[PDB]
Design a protein around this nucleic acid. Structure first.
Ligand SMILES: [Zn+2]
Ligand SMILES: [Zn+2]
Lengths: 79, 42, 54, 98, 51, 40, 180, 49, 213, 101, 151, 242, 190, 48
RNA sequence: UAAAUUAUGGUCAAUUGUUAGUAUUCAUAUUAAUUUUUUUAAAUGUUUUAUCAUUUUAUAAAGGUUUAUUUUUGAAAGAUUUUUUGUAUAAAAUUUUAGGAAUAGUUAAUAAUAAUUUAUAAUUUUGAUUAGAUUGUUUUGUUAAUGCUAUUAGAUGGGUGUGGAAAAAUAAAAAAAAUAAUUAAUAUAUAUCAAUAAUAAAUUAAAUUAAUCUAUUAGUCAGAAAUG
């Protein structure tokens, strides 16, 4: 929750959609969205997850953090 | 996590009409041997 | 964490209790200090003259 | 002489006692294990001294409890023991009332 | 103390029960014996007995 | 002065019934070994 | 006395003003509107405390019923009641002795109390204001005159001390033989 | 405001001819109390000696 | 106080002279204590100028060991006290099924002991006027100690816990049942050491000393 | 109660019983030897309202404070305000302060 | 003022005290008695009472003298009025015997520590099983949709 | 806007406003349907004056509800016409059969809500026909000639100045009040004998007459009349304290 | 109201019968710390900052608090706190001026314990009597300079050793052997 | 309630996040406490 | 180193999580929230005065502060026939940050002094100065409870030094020097950061004035419930 920076939901900006492989015993090809957002004049990069779905191209993303998933290092998920 | 990602609330039989529909419905043909003298309660 | 919600909807049975609906005695203030209006005066005879003045 | 202590079966109304509106039929309220209920005036026929008072300086534990917690975390069907409530049907069938 | 949103001193002394309109619980024709115990008589904490 | 009413105590467990002694435990109820001198 | 005045909120003079018996009350929904009657100064800061002198009471503008008394067959008692709690004795000390200005809504109330005479602005619209003339005013005083020996008393015991130590029962404070 | 300033005095004949009686009585009681606690200090001074 | 107003009526009308008696009958006896099988000699009262203090004791009972004081070293330590060490002497002895304990001797240590003994948690105690120690004889029942638990009010000395009379009235009130079971020793302002029961029967509260039951 | 009485609590009562004699047998044993104070007599005959009513006629309320109308404060402005004290409500005022309520 | 006073004195209902206008009941700043407020410990006004140890002291109802005061010197007025038990009282009263002993503290105490059990002298009445919504011979009337509990 | 949400005030008669979701729902689902034992008209014997006070055309035309379609306890908000006075309201047969709730103006035909019939305060025709001529023509004057002089009945009348319709209490007109109510003005006769704008004039006549007679207007003349006319014989005066 | 339960709430305007009107402020908010520096680059020298501060005074925690019940209130009755202060006069080198070092009371409610604390004051002494160490009584007045609101109101013990040390000529008190704590290994040889 | 305690309350570990928790440890702990309990008559007699 | 009671005196302390060998405030609960729902707000033109003037009307923009913010009758209340007095700036207690050290118009006395008077001066590890976050001391939340965790908004220099007090460049909802007005609390769609609504959420109806609103999502291995 470091990058949620305390608010309940944080808005960010799509950049890349790369695929990372979950942690064993699990198996998958999990969708890790390398996003960014400017906040408090420094700009930041947020490697996040995607459990939602996408219909229109929208680099508007509502990252709310979640539990742990079979991926090591992704504390943020989509709304 | 979020319950409504990839799909919203499944609206499935939001009125669930099977608990409603009564093609067999007692009518003026209630039995005077099994219904009350009012023919309203069995 | 409280991602669920409240734990009971505490509600109260409305029931009318027979003392509040019991008959109040009234007397409209126009039975103590009667209300009447001044027929118009020469400086302000009309209700357009009035607003022109005010 | 006992007081007329509050939050009885009779004192309380429905939405407090149970968690649905329940008719106040003066005839045959089976859920209060009651058979009939002639309702003469509250304090008319009893002798006067018996009108001891109204005690309610305790918890209405049926209805609201201190430090409410889901009795059994699992399965999710459990609240505090103050959430007694029957089952809500799907779409509500409203008959025509004669 | 006074005329901020959170007035205290008008409750500091004792005022009888105002039942002039529906302040939410049909206060004006609904007479509220049990509503007062459970509801508006202050309490020792949420749910504790009416103090 | 004890505003704990004795008349509103105990938490209801549904149907689970728990015993209560009117005065004294049913063990200590009877005293034959001492009214009838049946003792070492 | 300020370079750029505060426009809706100027009073007459000065930064801490004279004491005034105001009857404020927060504007929210009418059902939730009852009046904090209280002594205080004219020129306040934005809230009702920094020149609050002495909480004086609370008024219910909403007329309530006799749900504290039984159902009388008495009309004036069955009528709705309008209730207020004063601080009668600190009002007397402020108003009477420290001379705080009595505003007009609070006065409209205390008039109904019986402390103060019914105000200037309880105007019976239905009767005209008076017509003064010296001939009739002096002709009356001529007609009915009251004496110096009945007026000086009341002046004294109505604006000055009034516990008349009854000359007879001042005997109880003039000691007896062991020191007399 | 002849009656309104006739009162602003009467409530100095009433608030003072009452503070008179009541400070008289407060001193008649705080004097019993003042004197009694003073006596106890003297007594505990004795027992200390 | 009502059992004396009509027991002190024996005043003659004359304020008569008080009778002289034997050289000494008003002197307090000493409490008996066998000199040969013993913990310490019950030291006499005449030697009342031989008695030193708990902190600085005299030279008496050379035959016997001496308890030491309990004074810590740093900031980081809790500061024990005779009331702490007496409670844990007694706790360890009732845990070892001993009989006599040689327990520190301060005014409120034997204060706690005299009221515990009044409350029956102890078969007896004895002040040998030993400037440092005194002996508490423990009572047992069915194999287990009568002092079920005994706690200090404070595991520290630097923290005195004055008990409000209402605090001490909400112990004898277990959910509506008046309960003088667990006895709490508190030392009032009058330099008396009393249980909470006589402390709240006179509505004074005192320093918290021990809880016991 | 969970008071624990010392082994010989009853000595005071026991000597008072061993010595107290009675003018005759019936004062020795009568059913009101328990009842010592008015609290004892009311807690006994409280159930018995026929006895209580006569015995303790004070709890029976008879008297009260009359409803006493005041004379009213006179106003100098005469009938140009002789309505001004008159509404369709009653107006109840309760004084407060540091001292009252 | 004069014509109003004339009519006011003509009013009989007047000439009564309006205790709102007539006196300032307690003009000082502080109450005439401790009123439910806290105490040194915070024992809020309900958890306490007045007169205990927190009060102002009550002082010795005598004088505290040195050496030759009441130690066999003589006697104060508290020495002739006190009476020995044998000789009668001055004035006769018909004191009860029972209250006499009670007042003295010698009455055989009958407290409520001695009170045995209050037995059910009379069997009350047999408590026949009053039917509930969990005594329905048929699991139909006790559905989830009708019965949420027996009563 | 915003203040649409504000609930309409409820007084000391109004029971349940039914102004929110759950405030109407559990009462919404009561799908009433008229059966022959529901039908009010079956029950004329008991409720004759409930049958005879129905604005039937006003009902059907505006509502789609028939005199036959009316329950004896119909919760529907229909219009009626008072058979005693003749005013029109919108009242449900339920609150009129359960409670005897009716016309907001025949609410007060009886002098005091509390003691309604005990009033031996005399009638209108057998007492004061000079009101019988000014009251608006209703053909119900045959019954209103028994309304008490003390009745708060907001009766409508013919004025004499503007000829129009002015509605005032029968008591506020007649003047007399039943012993022990809130009494009305000393001049309420002279300030409701006319129209709310044409009741001004008959007043200042005697008011300026005295400004002329005396060169001075001071309301104290009625007072001084009462002292120069009514000597108090023996009004008990209290023992002074001074 | 506070004593009411969430769903039993209706009206956040009034409190019907009684109780405590107060704004349920939202303490539960995850206040954060936005790292605007690097663990080796801080614009402070002594106390670096790397996590949220708890802010307030009479609000920090451990909840230190004012306690008047100390040596001073045991010895002197006071009109207003701090008036009278007793200490080892330490430091008088400013001509006619004394530095009196006397303690107050800092009570810790949570622990149920105290610690009284030190403070070098300014204290005027016209005529230069006191020497470092005289246990003195100090009272407050009207101010005497920027920093001295006190004056030497007595002596409770004069350092007679010191006064004679001056009379003989030496320093009434030898000066501390070492300075304040430093960070540099000062290599004093010979 | 299987013992019949009408007025009692047991608390374990101070909170159900405090380990160790397990159905085993819960039953064992409460029964151990009910064993450690001393009667009031036994308390009294123990104090004579 | 004595028991005692004229019998409950002085007013409620009480802890409700399905865990997974064991050690340990530490995922899932409930409470208060936030995420979340338009039933509290709102307008412009301050107003008098003898007149190009003058009388009246003094702490919300930020401004970054932890040894910190403190002050009166002389204005006004405020009453007479005149000259009428001694009550004020000061303080005192509490002050943050992992790894901690030097700081500076300086300290005291003189002084109605010394831009160059006198001096062994003062702040600091009892944590100073710099820099960092931060509104400062009856308002909450949880808890049986010491706690832990909250409360806003208001004072950001002086420079013609006016005024009683600089707080003074627009941001009430105080009647503001003639009773204007209170038959009034209503306020249109405008806003700030306050302010918890799903107010009988489902059969018997609203002694109303008939006013707003058509009312919904969860899971379904553990553990309520599953198959195509
Ligand atoms: Zn009608
Ligand atoms: Zn007309």
């Amino acid at each position: 929750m470091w990058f949620l920076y305390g608010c309940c939901l944080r808005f960010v900006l799509f950049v890349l959609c790369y695929y990372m492989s979950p942690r064993l015993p699990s198996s998958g090809n999990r969708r890790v969205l390398y996003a960014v957002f400017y906040l408090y004049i420094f700009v930041w990069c947020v490697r996040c997850f995607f459990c939602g779905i996408f219909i229109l191209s929208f680099a508007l993303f509502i990252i709310e953090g979640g539990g742990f998933i079979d991926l090591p290092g992704i504390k943020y998920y989509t709304r | 996590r979020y319950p409504f990602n990839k799909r919203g609330p499944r609206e499935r039989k939001s009125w669930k009409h099977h608990v409603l529909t009564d093609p067999p419905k007692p009518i003026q043909w209630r039995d005077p041997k099994v219904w009350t003298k009012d023919l309203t309660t069995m | 964490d409280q991602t669920c919600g409240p734990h009971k909807s505490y509600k109260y049975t409305y029931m009318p209790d027979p003392r509040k609906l019991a008959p109040i005695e009234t007397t409209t203030r126009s039975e103590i200090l009667p209300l009447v209006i001044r027929p118009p005066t020469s400086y302000v005879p009309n209700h357009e003259t009035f607003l022109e003045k005010v | 002489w006992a007081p007329n202590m509050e939050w009885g079966i009779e004192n309380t109304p429905s939405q407090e006692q149970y968690q649905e509106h329940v008719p106040d039929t003066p005839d045959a309220d089976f859920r209060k294990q009651r058979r009939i209920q002639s309702r003469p005036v509250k304090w008319f026929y009893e002798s006067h001294y018996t009108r001891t008072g109204n005690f309610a300086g305790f918890q209405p534990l049926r209805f609201m409890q201190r430090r409410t917690e889901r009795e059994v975390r699992w399965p999710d069907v459990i609240n505090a023991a103050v959430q007694i409530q029957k089952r809500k049907p799907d779409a509500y069938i409203f008959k025509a009332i004669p | 103390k006074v005329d901020h949103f959170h007035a205290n001193n008008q409750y500091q002394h004792a005022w009888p029960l105002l039942s002039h309109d529906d302040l939410g619980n049909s206060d004006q024709s609904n007479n509220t014996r049990n509503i007062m115990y459970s509801m508006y008589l202050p309490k020792r904490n949420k749910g504790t007995a009416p103090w | 002065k004890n505003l704990n009413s004795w008349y509103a105590k105990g938490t209801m467990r549904g149907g689970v019934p728990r015993i209560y002694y009117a005065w004294m435990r049913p063990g200590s109820f009877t005293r034959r070994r001492f009214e009838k001198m049946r003792n070492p | 006395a300020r370079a750029i005045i505060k426009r809706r909120t100027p009073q007459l003079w000065g930064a801490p003003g004279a004491p005034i018996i105001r009857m404020r009350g927060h504007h929210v929904v009418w059902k939730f509107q009852s009046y904090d009657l209280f002594v205080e100064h004219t020129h306040k800061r934005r809230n009702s405390d920094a020149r609050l002198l002495h909480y004086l009471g609370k008024h219910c503008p909403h007329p309530q019923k006799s749900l504290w008394s039984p159902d009388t067959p008495v009309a004036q008692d069955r009528h709705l009641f309008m209730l207020t709690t004063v601080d009668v004795d600190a009002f007397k000390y402020w108003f009477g002795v420290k001379r705080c200005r009595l505003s007009m809504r609070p006065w409209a109330l205390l008039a109904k109390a019986g402390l103060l005479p019914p105000s200037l602005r309880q105007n019976s619209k239905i009767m005209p204001k008076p017509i003064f003339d010296k001939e009739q005013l002096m002709r009356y005083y001529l007609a009915n005159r009251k004496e110096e020996a009945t007026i000086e008393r009341e002046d004294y015991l109505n604006y000055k001390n009034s516990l008349v130590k009854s000359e007879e029962e001042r005997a109880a404070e003039r000691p007896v033989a062991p020191y007399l | 405001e002849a009656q309104f300033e006739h009162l602003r005095k009467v409530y100095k004949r009433q608030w003072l001819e009452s503070f008179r009686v009541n400070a008289d009585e407060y001193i008649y009681k705080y004097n019993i109390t003042k004197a009694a606690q003073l006596a106890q200090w003297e007594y505990e001074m004795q027992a200390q000696e | 106080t009502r059992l004396e107003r009509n027991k002190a009526n024996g005043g003659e009308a004359l304020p008569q002279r008080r009778l002289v008696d034997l050289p000494g009958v008003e002197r307090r006896r000493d409490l008996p204590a066998d000199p040969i099988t013993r913990l310490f000699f019950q030291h006499k009262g005449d030697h009342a100028l031989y008695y030193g203090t708990y902190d600085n004791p005299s030279l008496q009972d050379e035959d016997r060991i001496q308890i030491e004081k309990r004074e810590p070293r740093y900031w980081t330590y809790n500061v024990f006290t005779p009331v702490y060490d007496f409670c844990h002497r007694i706790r360890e002895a009732t845990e070892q099924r001993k009989r006599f304990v040689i327990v520190p001797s301060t005014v409120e240590t034997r204060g706690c002991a005299r009221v515990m003994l009044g409350h029956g948690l102890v078969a007896g105690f004895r002040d040998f006027h030993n400037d440092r120690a005194f002996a508490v004889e423990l009572k047992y029942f069915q194999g287990d100690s009568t002092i079920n638990v005994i706690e200090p009010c404070a595991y520290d000395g630097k923290t005195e816990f004055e008990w409000s009379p209402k605090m001490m009235r909400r112990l004898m009130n277990t959910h509506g049942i008046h309960n003088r079971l667990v006895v709490y020793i508190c030392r009032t302002a009058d330099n008396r050491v009393i249980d909470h029961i006589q402390a709240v029967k006179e509505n004074v509260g005192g320093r918290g000393l021990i809880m016991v039951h | 109660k969970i008071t624990f009485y010392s082994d010989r609590f009853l000595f005071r009562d026991l000597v008072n019983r061993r010595e107290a004699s009675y003018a005759n047998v019936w004062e020795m044993d009568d059913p009101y030897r328990f009842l010592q104070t008015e609290q004892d007599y009311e807690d006994y005959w409280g159930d018995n309202y026929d006895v209580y009513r006569r015995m303790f006629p004070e709890m029976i309320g008879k008297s009260g404070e009359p409803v006493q109308q005041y004379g009213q404060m006179p106003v100098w402005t005469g009938p140009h305000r002789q309505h001004a004290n008159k509404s369709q409500h009653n107006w109840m005022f309760a004084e407060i302060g540091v001292n009252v309520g | 003022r004069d014509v109003e006073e004339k009519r006011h004195s003509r009013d009989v209902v007047n000439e009564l005290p309006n205790p709102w206008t007539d006196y300032v009941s307690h003009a000082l700043p502080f109450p005439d008695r401790d009123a439910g407020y806290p105490d040194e410990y915070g024992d809020i006004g309900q958890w306490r009472a007045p007169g205990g140890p927190g009060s102002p002291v009550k002082g010795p109802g005598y004088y505290a003298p040195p050496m030759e005061g009441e130690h066999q010197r003589g006697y104060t007025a508290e020495w002739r009025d006190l009476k020995n038990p044998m000789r009668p009282p001055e004035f006769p009263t018909p004191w009860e015997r029972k209250y006499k002993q009670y007042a003295r503290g010698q009455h055989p105490s009958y407290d409520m520590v001695y009170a045995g059990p209050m037995p059910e002298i009379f069997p009350n009445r047999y408590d026949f099983r009053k039917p509930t919504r969990w005594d329905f011979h048929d699991i139909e009337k006790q559905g989830k949709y009708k019965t949420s509990g027996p009563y | 806007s915003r203040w649409s949400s504000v609930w309409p005030n409820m007084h000391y008669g109004a029971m349940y406003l039914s102004y929110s979701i759950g405030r109407k729902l559990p009462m919404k689902g009561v799908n009433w349907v008229t059966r022959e034992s529901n039908r009010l008209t079956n029950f004329s014997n008991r409720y004759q004056a409930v049958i005879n006070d129905i604005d039937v055309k006003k009902t059907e035309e505006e509502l789609g509800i028939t005199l036959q379609d009316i329950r004896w306890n119909d919760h529907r908000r229909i219009y009626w016409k008072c058979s005693f006075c003749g005013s029109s309201y919108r009242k449900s047969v339920s609150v009129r059969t359960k409670f005897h709730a009716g016309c907001n103006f025949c609410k007060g035909r009886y002098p005091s809500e509390v003691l309604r019939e005990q009033h031996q305060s005399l009638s209108l025709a057998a007492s004061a026909p000079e009101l019988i001529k000014q009251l608006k023509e209703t053909d119900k004057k045959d019954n209103l000639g028994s309304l008490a002089l003390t009745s708060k009945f907001r009766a409508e009348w013919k004025c004499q100045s503007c000829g129009g319709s002015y509605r005032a209490s029968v008591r506020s007109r007649t003047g007399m009040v039943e012993n022990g109510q809130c009494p009305l003005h000393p001049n309420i006769v002279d300030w409701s004998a006319y129209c709310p704008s044409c009741s001004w004039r008959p007043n200042m006549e005697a008011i300026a007459e005295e400004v002329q007679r005396t060169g001075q207007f001071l309301g104290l003349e009625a007072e001084s009349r009462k002292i120069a006319s009514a000597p108090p014989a023996r009004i008990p005066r209290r023992k002074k304290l001074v | 109201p506070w004593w009411n339960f969430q769903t039993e709430h209706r009206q956040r305007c009034v409190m019907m019968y009684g109780g405590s009107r107060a704004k349920n402020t939202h303490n539960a908010n995850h206040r954060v710390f936005i790292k605007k520096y690097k663990r080796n680059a801080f614009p402070n020298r002594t106390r670096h900052h790397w996590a949220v501060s708890m802010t307030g005074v009479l609000g920090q925690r451990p909840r230190r608090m004012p306690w008047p019940y100390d040596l001073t209130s045991l010895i002197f009755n006071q009109p207003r706190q701090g008036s009278d202060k007793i200490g080892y006069v330490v430091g008088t080198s400013m001509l006619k001026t004394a530095v009196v070092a006397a303690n107050h009371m800092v009570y810790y409610p949570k622990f149920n314990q105290r610690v009284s604390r030190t403070s070098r004051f300014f204290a005027h002494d016209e005529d230069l009597a006191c020497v470092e160490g005289d246990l003195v009584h100090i009272k407050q007045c009207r101010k005497i300079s920027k920093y001295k609101h006190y004056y030497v109101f007595s002596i409770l013990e004069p350092n007679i050793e010191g006064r004679e040390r001056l009379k003989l000529g030496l320093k009434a008190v030898p000066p501390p052997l070492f300075g304040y704590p430093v960070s540099r290994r000062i290599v004093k040889l010979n | 309630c299987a013992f019949g305690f009408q007025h009692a309350g047991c608390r374990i570990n101070l909170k159900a996040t405090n380990n160790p928790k397990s159905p085993t440890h819960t039953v064992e702990g409460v029964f151990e406490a009910v064993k450690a309990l001393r009667s009031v008559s036994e308390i009294a007699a123990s104090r004579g």
